[PDB]
């Protein structure tokens, strides 16, 4: 752990699970369910991340960690939104086959995916040659 890290990795999980675009992923992507759930769990990663950097201040660097924390947010918004894209694309198709838009779903969500992780990745860093 680590608060903030466990946070980020309850996001992370719920993530992993939405990738599988099984049956119950897919009720809950036409509701707003899962976009629902997903920016909740962001919301409780970066509360979690500011009290920790407040906490770590206590025992150019600071604009790099700044930086850092804000790609970490905006890939997870451009997770929500690329989700918020596939449930419009659906209502458009008007009953027609979703396979299709589900394999291109998939395959652009483990690239954004990839990128939350790499980005993750260097937040911790920052987070250390600052800890």
Request: with cysteine; charged share 30%.
């Amino acid at each position: 752990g680590q608060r903030w890290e466990l946070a980020l990795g309850r996001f992370w999980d719920y993530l992993r699970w939405v990738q599988t675009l099984s049956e119950q992923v897919q009720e809950e992507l036409l509701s707003s369910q899962v976009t629902q759930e997903l920016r909740a769990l962001m919301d409780e990663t970066m509360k979690e991340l500011k009290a920790y950097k407040s906490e770590l201040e206590e025992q150019r660097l600071s604009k790099e960690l700044q930086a850092a924390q804000a790609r970490l947010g905006a890939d997870m918004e451009d997770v929500c939104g690329r989700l918020v894209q596939y449930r419009g694309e659906v209502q458009a198709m008007l009953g027609q086959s979703t396979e299709e838009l589900r394999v291109r779903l998939a395959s652009h969500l483990r690239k954004l995916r990839k990128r939350l992780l790499r980005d993750a990745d260097a937040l911790q860093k920052c987070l250390a040659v600052y800890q």
